Amino acid sequence: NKITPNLAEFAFSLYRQLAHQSNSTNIFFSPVSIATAFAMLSLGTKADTHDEILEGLNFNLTEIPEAQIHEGFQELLRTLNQPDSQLQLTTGNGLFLSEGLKLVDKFLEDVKKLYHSEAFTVNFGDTEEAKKQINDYVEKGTQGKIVDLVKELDRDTVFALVNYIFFKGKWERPFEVKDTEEEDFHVDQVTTVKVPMMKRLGMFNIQHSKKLSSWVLLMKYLGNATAIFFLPDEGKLQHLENELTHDIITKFLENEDRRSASLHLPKLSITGTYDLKSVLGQLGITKVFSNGADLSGVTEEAPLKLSKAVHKAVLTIDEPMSIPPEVKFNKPFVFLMIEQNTKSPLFMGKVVNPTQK
Numbered sequence: 001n002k003i004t005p006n007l008a009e010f011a012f013s014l015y016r017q018l019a020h021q022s023n024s025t026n027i028f029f030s031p032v033s034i035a036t037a038f039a040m041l042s043l044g045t046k047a048d049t050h051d052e053i054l055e056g057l058n059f060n061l062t063e064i065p066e067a068q069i070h071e072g073f074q075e076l077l078r079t080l081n082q083p084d085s086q087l088q089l090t091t092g093n094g095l096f097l098s099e100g101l102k103l104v105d106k107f108l109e110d111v112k113k114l115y116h117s118e119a120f121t122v123n124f125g126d127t128e129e130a131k132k133q134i135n136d137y138v139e140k141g142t143q144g145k146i147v148d149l150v151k152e153l154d155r156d157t158v159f160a161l162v163n164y165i166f167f168k169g170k171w172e173r174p175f176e177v178k179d180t181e182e183e184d185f186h187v188d189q190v191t192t193v194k195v196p197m198m199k200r201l202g203m204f205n206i207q208h209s210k211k212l213s214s215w216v217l218l219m220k221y222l223g224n225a226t227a228i229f230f231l232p233d234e235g236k237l238q239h240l241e242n243e244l245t246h247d248i249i250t251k252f253l254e255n256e257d258r259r260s261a262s263l264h265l266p267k268l269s270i271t272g273t274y275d276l277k278s279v280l281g282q283l284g285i286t287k288v289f290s291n292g293a294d295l296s297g298v299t300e301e302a303p304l305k306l307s308k309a310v311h312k313a314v315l316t317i318d319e320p321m322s323i324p325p326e327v328k329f330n331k332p333f334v335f336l337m338i339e340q341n342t343k344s345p346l347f348m349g350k351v352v353n354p355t356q357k
């Protein structure tokens, strides 16, 4: 897909901002779902408000026409909404707009038809009930999986955007199931937590990378998704995060060479929740959240700004005579989950503490 390189750069920009903030925290977000939400929001924006959003998603507006960006997002959504993808992946965007605002019909039509998102009218005069209605939409949309997503709403809220993505992870290849034996996971030098570990001896798409100083393992999942796990060598996590590029990842995805290996793979479910106003502001997306926002494509008469923007991402695990290498994913590791048809980054992150709340 034409916009995959831009989404890859957005994934790295967002990942590196979060990793810079704290080196002890888990990171788990969807570059694809966040960018889709903000490209959608951009249809109701104009001038510097609009340009800041697309440049914030790593689209250089002097090189790529806007029509190709929206076509790229619509094609991506078509791929993600295919039956087999829908079996494992649920994605959605909820726009909550203050009642009594005269909404632009073209924006509502473009949101539903092009981005498959829902726009709702809500009473923000009752901030506790509005927060309940938003959370009920997310809970209904995720069949109970995501609850109390919006913990607090500002008193002056007139417009909220909620972006969610849920992935049911299951290995595509049938494997000889073993007991998930509890094993040590070295969070750091003095911290160890127990995790269910699946032990396997087989032919795996695994290699040790000199450039990245890491073991690199590629695994296939139901829903046309491939995960790439980077297990850094001792003291090389920062080097790994610094050296990652889109071209390096493409080379890994094109490789089909396999080798015998004894792997210890933790059966981990992961979640990430972000305040996009804070995170995206550091990437230069600020005007749409300010009093000066040009949201005249959403409402023509009244002033409007995006008061609240939240992202929630959830992954749950469903379910040679020479001694081969033994690789245990029993310490912090970085990951990317790619959609196979588009090569888009569905998820990106790092597991530091598997039992982190």
Ligand SMILES: CCC[C@@H](NC(=O)c1cccc2c1CC(=O)N2)[C@@H](O)c1cccc(Cl)c1C
Binding pocket: 169, 170, 171, 197, 198, 227, 229, 265, 266, 267, 268, 269, 270, 315, 317, 318, 319, 329, 335, 336, 337, 347, 351
């Ligand atoms: C290092 C491996 C981590 C992942 N584990 C598995 O996929 C796993 C482990 C044990 C048993 C079973 C599975 C899959 C299955 O069907 N059975 C997983 O926890 C995960 C962690 C963070 C990010 C990502 Cl993308 C994913 C997918």
